[PDB]
Amino acid sequence: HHWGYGKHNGPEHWHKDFPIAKGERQSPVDIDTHTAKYDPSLKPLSVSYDQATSLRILNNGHAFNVEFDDSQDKAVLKGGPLDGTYRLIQFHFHWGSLDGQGSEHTVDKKKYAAELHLVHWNTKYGDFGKAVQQPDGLAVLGIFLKVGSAKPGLQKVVDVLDSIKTKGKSADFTNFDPRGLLPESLDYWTYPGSLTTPPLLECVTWIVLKEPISVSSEQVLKFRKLNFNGEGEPEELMVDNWRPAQPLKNRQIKASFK
Ligand SMILES: O=C(Cc1nnn[nH]1)Nc1ccccc1
Ligand SMILES: [Zn+2]
Active site residues per annotation: 62
Task: Identify the residue whose C-alpha is closest to ligand 1 atom 11.
Answer: 195
Domain 2-258 in this protein, CATH class:
alpha beta
CB 77 within 8 A of CB 109: no
Q: Where are the domains of the chain?
A: 2-258
Q: Which atom of ligand 1 is nearest to the CA of 63?
A: 3
- Give 44: exposed, middle or buried? Use CB within 10 Å, 0-12, 13-18, 19+: exposed
CB 57 within 8 A of CB 171: yes
Q: Provide φ and ψ at 246, rounded to 5°.
A: -110, 165
At how many Å resolution was this determined?
1.4
Question: Is 1 a known ligand-binding residue?
Answer: no
Task: Tell me which ligand sits closest to the C-alpha of residue 60.
Answer: 1
* Residues at CB less than 6 angstroms from ligand 1: 92, 117, 119, 140, 195-197
Measured over the CA atoms of residue 164, residue 167, residue 170 and residue 175, the dihedral's sign is: positive
Task: Tell me which ligand sits closest to the C-alpha of residue 62.
Answer: 1
Ligand 1 pocket test: pick from 65, 119, 130, 242 the residue with the most ligand atoms within 8 Å of its Cβ.
119
Measured over the CA atoms of residue 146, residue 152, residue 157 and residue 161, the dihedral's sign is: positive
